[PDB]
Symmetry: D2
Subunit: 263 residues, 4 copies
Amino acid sequence: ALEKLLDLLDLEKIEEGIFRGQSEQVFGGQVVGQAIYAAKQTVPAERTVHSFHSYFLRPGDSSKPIIYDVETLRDGNSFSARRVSAIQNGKPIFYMTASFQSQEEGFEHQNTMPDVPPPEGLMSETDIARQGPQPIEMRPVKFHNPLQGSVEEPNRYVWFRANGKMPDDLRVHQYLLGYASDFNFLPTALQPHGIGFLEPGMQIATIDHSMWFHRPFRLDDWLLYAVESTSASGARGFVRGQIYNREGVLVASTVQEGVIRLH
Amino acid sequence: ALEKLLDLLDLEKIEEGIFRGQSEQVFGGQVVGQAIYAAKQTVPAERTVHSFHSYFLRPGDSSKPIIYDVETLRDGNSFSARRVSAIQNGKPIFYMTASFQSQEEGFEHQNTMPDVPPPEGLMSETDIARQFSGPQPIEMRPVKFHNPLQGSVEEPNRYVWFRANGKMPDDLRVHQYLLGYASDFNFLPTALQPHGIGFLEPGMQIATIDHSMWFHRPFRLDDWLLYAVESTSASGARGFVRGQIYNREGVLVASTVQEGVIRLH
Amino acid sequence: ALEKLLDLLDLEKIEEGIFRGQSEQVFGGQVVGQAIYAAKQTVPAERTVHSFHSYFLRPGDSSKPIIYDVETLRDGNSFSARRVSAIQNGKPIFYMTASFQSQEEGFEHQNTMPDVPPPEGLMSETDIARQGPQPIEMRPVKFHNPLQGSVEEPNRYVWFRANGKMPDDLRVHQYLLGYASDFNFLPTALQPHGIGFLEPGMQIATIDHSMWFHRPFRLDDWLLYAVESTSASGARGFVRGQIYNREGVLVASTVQEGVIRLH
Amino acid sequence: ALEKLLDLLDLEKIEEGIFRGQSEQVFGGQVVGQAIYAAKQTVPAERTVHSFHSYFLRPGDSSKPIIYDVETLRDGNSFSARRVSAIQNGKPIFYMTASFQSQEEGFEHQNTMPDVPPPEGLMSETDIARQFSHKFIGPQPIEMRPVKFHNPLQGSVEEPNRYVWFRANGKMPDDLRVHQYLLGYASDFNFLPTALQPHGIGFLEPGMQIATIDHSMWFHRPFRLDDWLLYAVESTSASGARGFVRGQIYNREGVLVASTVQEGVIRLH
């Protein structure tokens, strides 16, 4: 199941900077993961991803391949930048610009990971379904039922870990973390309003998704996703995320804005 | 100084989606502010900027103008999206993708503005600077002054009140262009605060990689706004900052995120 | 009136590969000449134009400028290639790809200039009309009536020369020859059907225009434009042209297909 | 041989406007025929190609696929225009703009086919090439019968005109578009070497560098390539280390079906 997700994030090469991906409406995290893979193939091997910004323009159709075209923007003394277009039926469904940097020691500092319960104690989402294994095991701190909200603070904490063995290749961990970053995210914005994201009449859609990979990490041990929604207004919802490993290291940050509209 | 900037953010048009901008090495906020104008021209009148992401690829040259090419990406039922290339000397120096939406009523919540002293007690940057040195288009009153030449191990937070140094039209578009400009002040340098180095100290290579912004709510820049910045991380010869901009009455008007090179050599 | 073309082809630079040119529908030759200037600005000094191919997508608007955006396609050991996009009202009206080569010594041969009366005995188009000044003086072997017309062979011969003394810069002669190359051309295809090119309800417009500059030349001495229409079929007419100088040297060849339609 | 080429010119679809073609350096005719196929897939079914212009920028490699990217430039009331990029190793080897139009009735005239001996009395290139093959030996996709033979390894000073009859080697489908792709392919044979005739150098002699720069074509009238067509070629000029050739293609009954123009590099080292 992980095996199958990883196989799917490993794209078929059509030509330099033209890739073709299969699908698991497509999960945004699939398009993100796949686009990272596509961009990374066009960069020097040593320069790993440190940031990306993306916009989702159209929904992706899960029954059809997605073509990833990669435009080489710049290769400098430190940075390589690439723009990925995800294409289906001759139309872009998503664009990402990503940047890549050689690892190098420099100034170090970070904030503090929130105080939360460890994972061992907590029930998985698959287990809370008991009242097929998922590629990524999620263990929430607090369960937020998608079919009935309740007015809650705009904060959500979730431990997550790859459901299986991961290879010793940090690039693969980065693609999967890109995938993983689009779970348990945007719905956090509905929490003060008491509506679950899958309730009748709720229109919820990602507009943009951006991520910064600060430090190395592995997804075969537990990471914590700390999400806050600092704002909602104008039928949009805004969420900021930070991903910590179990020892407290700040590994990645994320930002996302989406449509949140009750009909 | 403000009328000059405001004229300078008012772009010379060449065609539908091509614009030329005069410069004031170029200040990142200028490029950001110019690029926003460029995109907003190509969008339908009811739709205002709600977000942008940009990357800086090459330093701009202050002695020459900048061409802004604007690609139309999509015109949806509510959202329009534009990509702006900033071109100098045959080469792109900057790329922004921005999104615009019609003002609409929906779910409202926000976090809480940090408690800080009001602007009235506080000295402006120009005045502080004068001790260890003219009119500036935007006035800045820091809560705590972080000296660009000196500096000590401080918490990676910063708080700065700002306001336009002059008179502003009643066109919200121009405020937004100006807020894009102002968001690139007092920002990335916060990432040096834990390391006891000021950003103008010799050997300090500091440079913006990317700048992104989300305009949550309407505002005016002819009254005082607060910029609350934190550097949540630095590693790998990068520094990372997040910002939030609040009006006096506490309304969260915009958020920003930027990563840059920080290297002492 | 020639001084005002040579200035009108000396394009205003915006940035490297971006060009503004005043208009005088725009002619076509105007667009070709400006396009050729735009491209030559982007190429190494030693390399002069040897060929272009162009398509016409939309009618120009004489009231407004045209931007000419130039993509660099290749810079080889001998040849450089450029694609010029002529933009007005945020739409492309015309595209040209042009190739440039430095003058070099090689194999020489050519065909023979048609047998026609010399220009010295011939009336100019300004004299037959007498029966404002023109930038290029034209003396036709046979004047055709653009609002009348009768059936003749699909061949046309006209001598031409710039109405004025031109600079010693070969580039400007080439821009001007490109301009001149769209005069007395496409109408030739009507000659066999008895219809003038200003007759009412006759739809006529250049689809494509291509040229090869075989040899150096001056447009401040007589050149002969020798034009045949070898075909017309499906609302298109096809012409081929060859341009010889006074002494019989073949300097350029042309080819054009155009819409020719009876409403 | 014909079957194999027709299967090569029928490209694999990767997405809207993105196709990949296998190779028989790459013969220009293959690139041309494949590019017309690519462009035609993106245009309405009734609008057939009437013209194209192309530049060759780098040699193609036969051992690897070619990706054809098709850009939509305009779909107007009558005309659809498309620009095809042939890509290999992330670089363009060739660009083509092609225009397509609705088959209809309008003014009809043409020049006259040159009077040449018919193909029945003429030997084929493959039969003639026996005796020097030790330009080509076994079955070819298109049978060529030249009016005069031009030995690629030994020139003789001759006028800059060439006339050759040609035809597909086998039954072709009843689809015109295939005939057009295959005619695009055929149009690059017996063409640029015509420019060497006055200079008495065979196009395959040691030191002769000959390379297509551009290739353009106009499809005037419908035709079939499973009956004899005449390629009438002339070289009107050479200079500057370039050679210039114009072609006109006639069917046996005298109809002018297509015209062609190419310039190439012709340099003796």
